[PDB]
Amino acid sequence: GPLKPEEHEDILNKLLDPELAQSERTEALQQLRVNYGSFVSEYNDLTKEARSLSTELFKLKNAYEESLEHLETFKRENKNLQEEISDLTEQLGSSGKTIHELEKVRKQLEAEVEDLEKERDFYFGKLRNIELICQENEGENDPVLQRIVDILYATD
Amino acid sequence: PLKPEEHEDILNKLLDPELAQSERTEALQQLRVNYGSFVSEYNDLTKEARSLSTELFKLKNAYEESLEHLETFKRENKNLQEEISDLTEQLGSSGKTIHELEKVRKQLEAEVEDLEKERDFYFGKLRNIELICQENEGENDPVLQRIVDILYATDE
């Protein structure tokens, strides 16, 4: 780009001698002049660049805060959905425990019905068998047997 | 640093090789000091620029990380919310199992009751018949003896 400090100094040295080539004197000044105009334009450009960088910054700062706000509202919804799932699985736990107890109850009741059915059949079959014996012997006209028959035939 | 016109005015003095040696040394020193400090202010600004080009870089990265965290929570929240509807169906059917098992419990308890009544009814008849056979033991009646054999026979 422009002139480095030690190069600039090289020209100043030439300009010190009051009796060096006048053509080279005026040529040395035009170098200093053209250099100084470039260095001002370089500095200016660099100032326009830093200003625009500062504008990109706080334009990105507006975006960062909208995103940090957006991200926080999903963090909260994520936590709310967590507690939601937690509460449903606690209910599934209790529901499951209730079902397990009702199934034990059902199993107990079915074993009791089986037993009671078989006991009822056992008594009924005895009454059938006893009526066959009364029937075999009815020609005896035995009033004791007929009392047994009266018990057998009585309806609820 | 000095304005381009002040710089020019110092070049205009130096154009003259007959300028007094004291005036020339001071002029040259004016351009010397000015140039070094201009290069300083230029280099301060360059490192000041690249400073904000790094902060902008870090912030850009942070902002994009913020966006990606928001996409992760979004995708996760839809996944949680679909999990809740699944858990909710599971719990809904769980409650239906409880209601069905409760209806079954009531029906089986009512059936146990009915079978106890019917069992007691036939048993009551057998008891009345045992009493008749007991009261008529003295008869030594083989028909009653066969009825007694039935009353006391075992299920096996």
Side-chain angles (χ1 to χ4, degrees):
Chain A
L3 274 181
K4 230 199 144 237
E6 73 284 331
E7 340 191 31
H8 186 257
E9 179 62 39
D10 200 47
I11 283 167
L12 302 194
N13 281 26
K14 306 214 311 283
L15 293 172
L16 177 68
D17 192 317
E19 294 184 22
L20 99 158
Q22 173 58 55
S23 338
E24 189 179 6
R25 162 164 300 256
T26 320
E27 149 203 332
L29 297 174
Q30 166 75 353
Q31 299 177 225
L32 290 176
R33 175 184 300 119
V34 151
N35 191 61
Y36 206 70
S38 309
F39 207 50
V40 169
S41 111
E42 240 66 49
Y43 187 90
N44 282 348
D45 296 339
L46 202 270
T47 52
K48 292 176 279 280
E49 292 169 299
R51 282 173 183 156
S52 74
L53 294 175
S54 190
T55 67
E56 284 199 348
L57 254 205
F58 299 105
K59 285 217 317 187
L60 181 51
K61 191 61 194 184
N62 284 254
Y64 199 62
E65 284 323 294
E66 169 154 71
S67 77
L68 246 40
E69 169 230 4
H70 281 185
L71 179 64
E72 193 58 31
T73 65
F74 281 82
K75 267 259 201 185
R76 263 215 109 184
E77 171 70 351
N78 177 272
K79 233 150 284 183
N80 174 242
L81 295 172
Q82 228 86 271
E83 252 248 15
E84 223 154 271
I85 285 161
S86 164
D87 288 352
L88 278 42
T89 50
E90 177 187 76
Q91 289 175 35
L92 280 165
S94 35
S95 267
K97 166 63 171 39
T98 298
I99 288 166
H100 178 70
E101 289 305 328
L102 282 171
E103 269 170 5
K104 285 162 64 179
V105 162
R106 170 180 201 164
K107 175 251 195 83
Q108 287 297 350
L109 285 172
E110 282 169 347
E112 298 178 351
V113 171
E114 288 199 357
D115 292 331
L116 284 165
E117 220 101 303
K118 289 171 193 191
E119 169 177 22
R120 188 270 324 264
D121 296 348
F122 176 72
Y123 297 159
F124 186 87
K126 286 189 188 303
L127 297 167
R128 280 233 277 156
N129 295 346
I130 287 163
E131 107 76 45
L132 291 186
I133 289 167
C134 291
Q135 186 185 147
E136 159 187 4
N137 298 280
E138 55 179 58
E140 295 192 275
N141 302 125
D142 180 359
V144 174
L145 286 191
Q146 180 60 46
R147 298 210 286 137
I148 295 171
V149 174
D150 285 352
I151 293 162
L152 293 166
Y153 291 2
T155 42
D156 45 14
Chain B
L2 28 79
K3 311 300 177 182
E5 271 184 54
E6 299 172 280
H7 187 259
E8 185 57 45
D9 283 321
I10 297 172
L11 305 183
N12 286 341
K13 305 163 86 163
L14 297 167
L15 220 219
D16 184 22
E18 316 296 327
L19 170 74
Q21 28 189 4
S22 193
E23 279 73 290
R24 160 130 56 242
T25 288
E26 292 161 356
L28 293 172
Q29 178 68 7
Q30 294 182 61
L31 300 174
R32 182 179 297 115
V33 177
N34 176 65
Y35 202 66
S37 82
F38 203 162
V39 174
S40 185
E41 296 198 34
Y42 184 82
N43 278 336
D44 291 359
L45 233 62
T46 277
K47 69 99 182 179
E48 183 100 274
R50 221 173 67 180
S51 139
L52 307 194
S53 187
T54 278
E55 314 281 44
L56 258 171
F57 162 85
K58 297 196 166 182
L59 192 53
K60 285 157 183 161
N61 169 74
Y63 163 87
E64 204 202 46
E65 296 272 338
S66 217
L67 298 188
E68 184 157 22
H69 284 143
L70 189 124
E71 194 70 46
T72 294
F73 281 114
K74 279 229 305 319
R75 186 144 37 194
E76 212 187 293
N77 285 2
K78 270 71 171 175
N79 294 346
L80 263 33
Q81 286 193 266
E82 294 299 335
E83 197 178 89
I84 286 158
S85 98
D86 271 25
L87 272 54
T88 301
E89 266 120 45
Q90 184 186 0
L91 178 62
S93 62
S94 214
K96 215 141 292 177
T97 297
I98 290 173
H99 280 171
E100 291 277 37
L101 280 169
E102 289 277 31
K103 194 49 183 73
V104 163
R105 171 174 191 161
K106 300 164 200 291
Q107 277 157 179
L108 283 167
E109 293 181 6
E111 177 177 22
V112 162
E113 291 182 302
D114 292 338
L115 286 170
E116 283 162 358
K117 175 69 226 89
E118 194 195 6
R119 164 209 76 196
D120 293 352
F121 183 67
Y122 303 142
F123 185 85
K125 291 181 192 279
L126 295 169
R127 164 65 66 212
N128 278 324
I129 295 167
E130 179 275 306
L131 264 351
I132 290 185
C133 293
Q134 186 192 144
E135 290 150 17
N136 291 274
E137 184 273 325
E139 290 182 340
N140 180 24
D141 181 354
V143 172
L144 295 189
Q145 284 172 297
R146 261 207 294 152
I147 292 170
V148 165
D149 282 339
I150 286 171
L151 293 165
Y152 287 88
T154 47
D155 205 334
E156 40 169 327

Coordinates of all heavy atoms in Angstrom, one line a residue, chain A residues 40-102:
Chain A
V40 N -4.3 9.0 3.5 CA -5.6 9.5 3.9 C -6.8 8.7 3.4 O -7.7 8.4 4.1 CB -5.7 11.0 3.5 CG1 -7.1 11.5 3.7 CG2 -4.7 11.8 4.3
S41 N -6.7 8.3 2.1 CA -7.7 7.4 1.6 C -7.8 6.1 2.2 O -8.9 5.5 2.5 CB -7.6 7.3 0.0 OG -7.3 6.0 -0.3
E42 N -6.6 5.5 2.5 CA -6.6 4.2 3.2 C -7.2 4.3 4.6 O -8.0 3.5 5.0 CB -5.1 3.7 3.3 CG -4.9 2.4 2.7 CD -5.1 2.4 1.2 OE1 -4.5 3.3 0.5 OE2 -5.8 1.5 0.6
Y43 N -6.8 5.3 5.4 CA -7.4 5.6 6.7 C -8.9 5.8 6.6 O -9.6 5.2 7.4 CB -6.7 6.8 7.3 CG -7.0 7.0 8.8 CD1 -6.3 6.4 9.8 CD2 -8.1 7.8 9.1 CE1 -6.6 6.6 11.1 CE2 -8.5 8.0 10.5 CZ -7.7 7.4 11.5 OH -8.1 7.6 12.8
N44 N -9.3 6.6 5.7 CA -10.8 6.8 5.5 C -11.5 5.5 5.3 O -12.5 5.2 6.0 CB -11.0 7.8 4.3 CG -10.7 9.3 4.7 OD1 -10.6 9.6 5.9 ND2 -10.7 10.1 3.7
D45 N -11.1 4.8 4.3 CA -11.7 3.5 4.0 C -11.7 2.6 5.3 O -12.8 2.0 5.5 CB -10.9 2.7 2.9 CG -11.0 3.5 1.6 OD1 -11.9 4.3 1.4 OD2 -10.1 3.2 0.7
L46 N -10.7 2.6 6.0 CA -10.7 1.8 7.3 C -11.6 2.3 8.3 O -12.1 1.6 9.1 CB -9.2 1.7 7.8 CG -8.9 0.6 8.8 CD1 -9.1 1.0 10.2 CD2 -9.6 -0.7 8.4
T47 N -11.9 3.6 8.2 CA -12.9 4.2 9.2 C -14.3 3.8 8.7 O -15.2 3.6 9.6 CB -12.7 5.7 9.3 OG1 -12.7 6.3 8.0 CG2 -11.4 6.0 10.0
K48 N -14.6 3.8 7.4 CA -15.9 3.4 6.9 C -16.1 1.9 7.2 O -17.2 1.5 7.5 CB -16.0 3.6 5.4 CG -16.1 5.1 5.0 CD -16.2 5.3 3.5 CE -14.8 5.3 2.9 NZ -14.0 6.5 3.0
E49 N -15.0 1.1 7.3 CA -15.1 -0.3 7.5 C -15.5 -0.6 9.0 O -16.3 -1.4 9.3 CB -13.9 -1.0 7.1 CG -13.7 -1.1 5.6 CD -12.3 -1.6 5.1 OE1 -11.3 -0.9 5.5 OE2 -12.3 -2.6 4.4
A50 N -14.8 0.1 9.9 CA -15.1 -0.1 11.3 C -16.5 0.4 11.7 O -17.2 -0.2 12.5 CB -14.0 0.7 12.2
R51 N -16.9 1.5 11.1 CA -18.3 2.0 11.4 C -19.3 0.9 10.9 O -20.3 0.6 11.7 CB -18.6 3.3 10.7 CG -17.9 4.5 11.4 CD -18.1 5.8 10.5 NE -17.5 6.9 11.1 CZ -17.0 8.0 10.5 NH1 -17.2 8.1 9.2 NH2 -16.5 9.0 11.1
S52 N -19.2 0.3 9.7 CA -20.1 -0.6 9.3 C -20.0 -1.9 10.1 O -21.0 -2.6 10.3 CB -19.9 -1.0 7.8 OG -18.7 -1.7 7.6
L53 N -18.8 -2.2 10.6 CA -18.7 -3.4 11.5 C -19.5 -3.1 12.8 O -20.2 -4.0 13.3 CB -17.3 -3.7 11.8 CG -16.4 -4.2 10.7 CD1 -15.0 -4.3 11.1 CD2 -16.9 -5.5 10.1
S54 N -19.5 -1.9 13.3 CA -20.2 -1.6 14.5 C -21.7 -1.7 14.3 O -22.5 -2.0 15.2 CB -19.9 -0.2 15.1 OG -20.4 0.0 16.3
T55 N -22.2 -1.4 13.0 CA -23.6 -1.5 12.7 C -24.0 -2.9 12.6 O -25.1 -3.3 13.0 CB -23.9 -0.7 11.4 OG1 -23.3 -1.3 10.3 CG2 -23.5 0.7 11.5
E56 N -23.2 -3.8 12.0 CA -23.5 -5.2 11.9 C -23.6 -5.8 13.3 O -24.5 -6.6 13.6 CB -22.4 -6.0 11.1 CG -22.5 -5.8 9.6 CD -21.8 -6.9 8.9 OE1 -21.0 -7.6 9.5 OE2 -21.9 -7.0 7.6
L57 N -22.7 -5.4 14.2 CA -22.8 -5.8 15.6 C -24.1 -5.6 16.2 O -24.8 -6.6 16.5 CB -21.7 -5.1 16.5 CG -20.4 -5.8 16.9 CD1 -19.9 -5.1 18.2 CD2 -20.7 -7.3 17.1
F58 N -24.5 -4.4 16.5 CA -25.8 -4.2 17.2 C -27.0 -4.5 16.3 O -28.1 -4.7 16.9 CB -25.8 -2.7 17.6 CG -24.7 -2.3 18.6 CD1 -23.6 -1.6 18.2 CD2 -24.7 -2.8 19.9 CE1 -22.6 -1.2 19.1 CE2 -23.7 -2.5 20.8 CZ -22.7 -1.7 20.4
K59 N -26.9 -4.7 15.0 CA -27.9 -5.4 14.3 C -28.0 -6.9 14.6 O -29.0 -7.5 14.7 CB -27.7 -5.2 12.8 CG -28.1 -3.8 12.3 CD -28.8 -3.9 10.9 CE -28.0 -4.9 10.0 NZ -28.6 -4.8 8.6
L60 N -26.8 -7.5 14.8 CA -26.8 -8.9 15.3 C -27.1 -9.0 16.8 O -27.5 -10.1 17.3 CB -25.4 -9.5 15.0 CG -25.1 -10.9 15.5 CD1 -26.2 -11.9 14.9 CD2 -23.8 -11.4 15.0
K61 N -26.9 -7.9 17.6 CA -27.3 -7.9 19.0 C -28.8 -8.0 19.1 O -29.3 -8.6 20.0 CB -26.7 -6.7 19.7 CG -26.8 -6.8 21.2 CD -26.1 -8.0 21.7 CE -26.5 -8.3 23.2 NZ -25.7 -9.5 23.7
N62 N -29.5 -7.3 18.2 CA -31.0 -7.3 18.2 C -31.4 -8.7 17.9 O -32.5 -9.2 18.5 CB -31.5 -6.3 17.2 CG -31.5 -4.9 17.7 OD1 -32.5 -4.3 18.1 ND2 -30.3 -4.3 17.7
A63 N -30.7 -9.4 17.1 CA -31.1 -10.8 16.7 C -30.8 -11.8 17.8 O -31.6 -12.6 18.1 CB -30.4 -11.2 15.4
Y64 N -29.6 -11.6 18.5 CA -29.2 -12.5 19.5 C -30.2 -12.5 20.7 O -30.5 -13.5 21.3 CB -27.8 -12.2 20.0 CG -27.1 -13.2 20.8 CD1 -26.8 -14.5 20.3 CD2 -26.8 -13.0 22.2 CE1 -26.2 -15.4 21.0 CE2 -26.1 -14.0 22.9 CZ -25.8 -15.2 22.3 OH -25.2 -16.2 23.0
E65 N -30.7 -11.3 21.0 CA -31.7 -11.2 22.1 C -33.0 -11.7 21.8 O -33.7 -12.3 22.6 CB -31.8 -9.7 22.6 CG -30.6 -9.2 23.4 CD -30.0 -10.3 24.3 OE1 -30.7 -10.7 25.3 OE2 -28.9 -10.7 24.1
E66 N -33.4 -11.6 20.5 CA -34.7 -12.2 20.1 C -34.6 -13.8 20.1 O -35.5 -14.5 20.4 CB -35.1 -11.8 18.7 CG -36.2 -12.6 18.1 CD -37.1 -11.9 17.1 OE1 -36.6 -11.6 16.0 OE2 -38.2 -11.5 17.4
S67 N -33.4 -14.3 19.8 CA -33.2 -15.7 19.8 C -33.0 -16.3 21.3 O -33.6 -17.3 21.6 CB -31.9 -16.1 19.0 OG -30.7 -15.8 19.7
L68 N -32.3 -15.6 22.1 CA -32.2 -15.9 23.5 C -33.5 -15.9 24.2 O -33.7 -16.6 25.2 CB -31.2 -15.0 24.2 CG -29.9 -15.6 24.8 CD1 -29.2 -16.6 23.8 CD2 -28.9 -14.4 25.0
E69 N -34.4 -15.1 23.7 CA -35.8 -15.0 24.3 C -36.6 -16.1 23.8 O -37.3 -16.7 24.5 CB -36.5 -13.7 23.9 CG -37.9 -13.6 24.2 CD -38.8 -13.2 23.0 OE1 -38.3 -13.1 21.9 OE2 -40.1 -13.1 23.3
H70 N -36.4 -16.4 22.5 CA -37.2 -17.5 21.8 C -36.7 -18.8 22.4 O -37.6 -19.6 22.7 CB -36.9 -17.5 20.3 CG -37.6 -16.5 19.5 ND1 -37.6 -16.4 18.1 CD2 -38.5 -15.5 19.9 CE1 -38.3 -15.5 17.7 NE2 -38.9 -14.9 18.7
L71 N -35.4 -19.0 22.6 CA -34.9 -20.3 23.2 C -35.4 -20.4 24.6 O -35.6 -21.5 25.0 CB -33.4 -20.2 23.2 CG -32.7 -21.4 23.7 CD1 -33.0 -22.6 22.9 CD2 -31.2 -21.2 23.8
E72 N -35.5 -19.4 25.3 CA -36.0 -19.5 26.7 C -37.4 -20.0 26.8 O -37.8 -20.7 27.7 CB -35.8 -18.2 27.5 CG -35.9 -18.4 29.0 CD -35.0 -19.4 29.6 OE1 -33.9 -19.5 29.1 OE2 -35.4 -20.0 30.6
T73 N -38.3 -19.6 25.8 CA -39.7 -19.9 25.9 C -39.9 -21.4 25.5 O -40.8 -22.0 26.0 CB -40.5 -19.1 25.0 OG1 -40.2 -19.3 23.6 CG2 -40.4 -17.6 25.4
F74 N -39.0 -22.0 24.7 CA -39.0 -23.4 24.4 C -38.5 -24.2 25.6 O -39.0 -25.3 25.9 CB -38.3 -23.7 23.1 CG -39.1 -23.3 21.9 CD1 -39.2 -22.0 21.4 CD2 -39.8 -24.3 21.2 CE1 -39.9 -21.7 20.3 CE2 -40.6 -24.0 20.1 CZ -40.7 -22.7 19.7
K75 N -37.4 -23.7 26.2 CA -36.9 -24.3 27.4 C -38.0 -24.5 28.5 O -38.1 -25.5 29.1 CB -35.8 -23.5 28.0 CG -34.4 -23.9 27.6 CD -33.7 -24.7 28.7 CE -32.1 -24.7 28.5 NZ -31.4 -25.6 29.5
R76 N -38.9 -23.4 28.6 CA -40.0 -23.5 29.6 C -41.0 -24.5 29.1 O -41.5 -25.3 29.9 CB -40.6 -22.1 29.8 CG -40.1 -21.4 31.1 CD -41.2 -20.6 31.7 NE -41.7 -21.1 33.0 CZ -42.7 -20.6 33.8 NH1 -43.3 -19.6 33.4 NH2 -43.0 -21.2 34.9
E77 N -41.4 -24.5 27.8 CA -42.4 -25.4 27.3 C -41.8 -26.9 27.4 O -42.5 -27.8 27.7 CB -42.7 -25.1 25.9 CG -43.6 -26.2 25.1 CD -45.0 -26.4 25.6 OE1 -45.4 -25.8 26.7 OE2 -45.8 -27.1 25.0
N78 N -40.5 -27.0 27.2 CA -39.9 -28.3 27.3 C -40.0 -28.8 28.8 O -40.2 -30.0 29.0 CB -38.4 -28.3 26.9 CG -37.6 -29.6 27.1 OD1 -37.1 -29.8 28.2 ND2 -37.6 -30.4 26.1
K79 N -39.8 -27.9 29.7 CA -39.9 -28.3 31.1 C -41.4 -28.6 31.5 O -41.6 -29.5 32.3 CB -39.4 -27.2 32.0 CG -38.3 -27.7 33.1 CD -37.3 -26.6 33.4 CE -36.3 -26.4 32.3 NZ -35.2 -25.4 32.6
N80 N -42.3 -27.8 30.9 CA -43.7 -28.1 31.2 C -44.1 -29.5 30.6 O -44.9 -30.2 31.2 CB -44.6 -27.0 30.6 CG -46.1 -27.3 30.7 OD1 -46.8 -27.4 29.7 ND2 -46.6 -27.5 31.9
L81 N -43.6 -29.8 29.4 CA -44.0 -31.1 28.8 C -43.3 -32.2 29.6 O -43.9 -33.3 29.7 CB -43.5 -31.1 27.4 CG -44.3 -30.2 26.4 CD1 -43.6 -30.2 25.1 CD2 -45.8 -30.5 26.4
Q82 N -42.2 -32.0 30.3 CA -41.6 -33.0 31.1 C -42.5 -33.3 32.3 O -42.7 -34.5 32.6 CB -40.2 -32.4 31.6 CG -39.1 -33.4 31.5 CD -38.5 -33.3 30.1 OE1 -38.9 -34.0 29.2 NE2 -37.4 -32.4 30.0
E83 N -42.9 -32.3 33.1 CA -43.8 -32.5 34.2 C -45.1 -33.1 33.8 O -45.6 -33.9 34.5 CB -44.0 -31.1 34.8 CG -43.4 -30.9 36.2 CD -44.4 -30.9 37.3 OE1 -45.6 -31.2 37.1 OE2 -44.0 -30.4 38.4
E84 N -45.5 -32.8 32.6 CA -46.7 -33.5 32.0 C -46.5 -35.0 31.9 O -47.4 -35.8 32.4 CB -47.1 -32.9 30.7 CG -48.5 -32.6 30.4 CD -48.8 -31.4 29.4 OE1 -48.8 -30.3 29.8 OE2 -48.9 -31.8 28.2
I85 N -45.4 -35.4 31.3 CA -45.1 -36.8 31.2 C -44.9 -37.5 32.6 O -45.4 -38.6 32.8 CB -43.9 -37.0 30.3 CG1 -44.3 -36.8 28.8 CG2 -43.3 -38.4 30.5 CD1 -43.1 -36.5 28.0
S86 N -44.3 -36.8 33.4 CA -44.1 -37.3 34.8 C -45.4 -37.6 35.5 O -45.6 -38.6 36.1 CB -43.2 -36.2 35.6 OG -43.3 -36.5 37.0
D87 N -46.4 -36.7 35.3 CA -47.6 -36.8 36.0 C -48.5 -38.0 35.4 O -49.2 -38.6 36.1 CB -48.4 -35.5 36.0 CG -47.9 -34.5 36.9 OD1 -46.9 -34.8 37.7 OD2 -48.3 -33.3 36.9
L88 N -48.3 -38.2 34.1 CA -49.1 -39.3 33.5 C -48.5 -40.7 33.9 O -49.2 -41.6 34.0 CB -49.1 -39.2 32.0 CG -50.1 -38.2 31.3 CD1 -50.3 -36.9 32.0 CD2 -49.7 -38.0 29.9
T89 N -47.2 -40.7 34.0 CA -46.6 -42.0 34.4 C -46.8 -42.4 35.9 O -46.9 -43.5 36.2 CB -45.1 -42.1 34.1 OG1 -44.4 -40.9 34.6 CG2 -44.9 -42.1 32.6
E90 N -46.9 -41.3 36.7 CA -47.4 -41.6 38.1 C -48.8 -42.1 38.1 O -49.1 -43.0 39.0 CB -47.2 -40.3 38.9 CG -47.7 -40.5 40.4 CD -47.8 -39.2 41.1 OE1 -48.7 -38.3 40.9 OE2 -46.9 -38.9 42.0
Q91 N -49.6 -41.7 37.2 CA -51.0 -42.1 37.2 C -51.0 -43.6 36.6 O -51.8 -44.4 37.1 CB -51.9 -41.2 36.4 CG -52.1 -39.9 37.1 CD -52.9 -38.8 36.3 OE1 -53.8 -39.2 35.5 NE2 -52.6 -37.6 36.5
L92 N -50.2 -43.8 35.6 CA -50.1 -45.2 35.1 C -49.6 -46.2 36.2 O -50.1 -47.3 36.2 CB -49.2 -45.2 33.9 CG -49.9 -44.7 32.6 CD1 -48.9 -44.4 31.5 CD2 -51.0 -45.8 32.1
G93 N -48.7 -45.7 37.0 CA -48.3 -46.5 38.1 C -49.4 -46.9 39.0 O -49.6 -48.1 39.4
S94 N -50.2 -45.9 39.5 CA -51.3 -46.2 40.4 C -52.4 -47.0 39.7 O -52.8 -48.0 40.2 CB -51.8 -44.9 40.9 OG -51.8 -43.9 39.9
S95 N -52.8 -46.6 38.5 CA -53.7 -47.4 37.7 C -53.3 -48.8 37.6 O -54.1 -49.8 37.7 CB -53.9 -46.8 36.3 OG -55.0 -45.9 36.3
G96 N -52.0 -49.1 37.2 CA -51.5 -50.4 37.1 C -51.6 -51.2 38.4 O -52.0 -52.3 38.5
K97 N -51.4 -50.5 39.5 CA -51.5 -51.1 40.9 C -53.0 -51.5 41.2 O -53.2 -52.5 41.7 CB -50.9 -50.3 42.0 CG -51.3 -50.7 43.4 CD -50.8 -52.1 43.7 CE -51.0 -52.5 45.2 NZ -52.3 -52.0 45.8
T98 N -53.9 -50.7 40.8 CA -55.3 -50.9 41.0 C -55.8 -52.2 40.2 O -56.4 -53.0 40.8 CB -56.2 -49.8 40.6 OG1 -55.9 -48.6 41.4 CG2 -57.7 -50.0 40.7
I99 N -55.4 -52.2 39.0 CA -55.7 -53.4 38.1 C -55.1 -54.6 38.6 O -55.9 -55.6 38.6 CB -55.1 -53.1 36.6 CG1 -55.9 -52.0 35.9 CG2 -55.1 -54.4 35.9 CD1 -55.3 -51.5 34.7
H100 N -53.9 -54.6 39.1 CA -53.3 -55.8 39.7 C -54.1 -56.3 40.9 O -54.3 -57.5 41.0 CB -51.9 -55.5 40.1 CG -51.2 -56.6 40.8 ND1 -50.8 -57.8 40.1 CD2 -50.8 -56.8 42.0 CE1 -50.2 -58.6 40.9 NE2 -50.2 -58.1 42.1
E101 N -54.6 -55.4 41.7 CA -55.4 -55.8 42.9 C -56.8 -56.4 42.4 O -57.3 -57.3 43.0 CB -55.6 -54.7 43.9 CG -54.3 -54.4 44.6 CD -53.6 -55.6 45.4 OE1 -54.4 -56.5 45.8 OE2 -52.4 -55.7 45.5
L102 N -57.5 -55.7 41.5 CA -58.8 -56.2 41.0 C -58.7 -57.5 40.3 O -59.6 -58.3 40.4 CB -59.4 -55.1 40.0 CG -60.0 -53.9 40.7 CD1 -60.4 -52.9 39.7 CD2 -61.2 -54.4 41.5

